[PDB]
């Protein structure tokens, strides 16, 4: 129940999968981000923890062409670099 405020690019990402608010729980931020990635089918078929985000708004937010969903800290770090504070 800590609410965070996505900076504009993160917000745009959330809004492309139906997000309506200015603020969000982290669980919400991940929810939408998870949906975007399933939706756009960005995960690797065989190795489904691999996400290819080069050439995508998600790539702009993250600053990498790919990442593993096992790199928990890395992912939360990207998000937390993209919050109004």
């Amino acid at each position: 129940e800590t609410l965070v405020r996505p900076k504009p690019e993160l917000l745009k990402l959330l809004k492309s999968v139906g997000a309506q608010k200015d603020t969000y729980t982290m669980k919400e931020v991940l929810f939408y981000l998870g949906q975007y990635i399933m939706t756009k089918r960005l995960y690797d078929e065989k190795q489904q923890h691999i996400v290819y985000c080069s050439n995508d708004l998600l790539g702009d937010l993250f600053g990498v062409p790919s990442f593993s969903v096992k790199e928990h800290r890395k992912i939360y770090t990207m998000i937390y670099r993209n919050l109004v504070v």
């Binding site: 991940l30 929810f31 998870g34 399933m38 995960y43 923890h49």
Partner: peptide, 14 residues
């Protein structure tokens, strides 16, 4: 799918 269960893991930290 496998991606949903790696991602579900991710949500436990939040």
């Amino acid at each position: 799918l496998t991606f949903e269960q790696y991602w579900a893991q991710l949500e436990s930290a939040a």
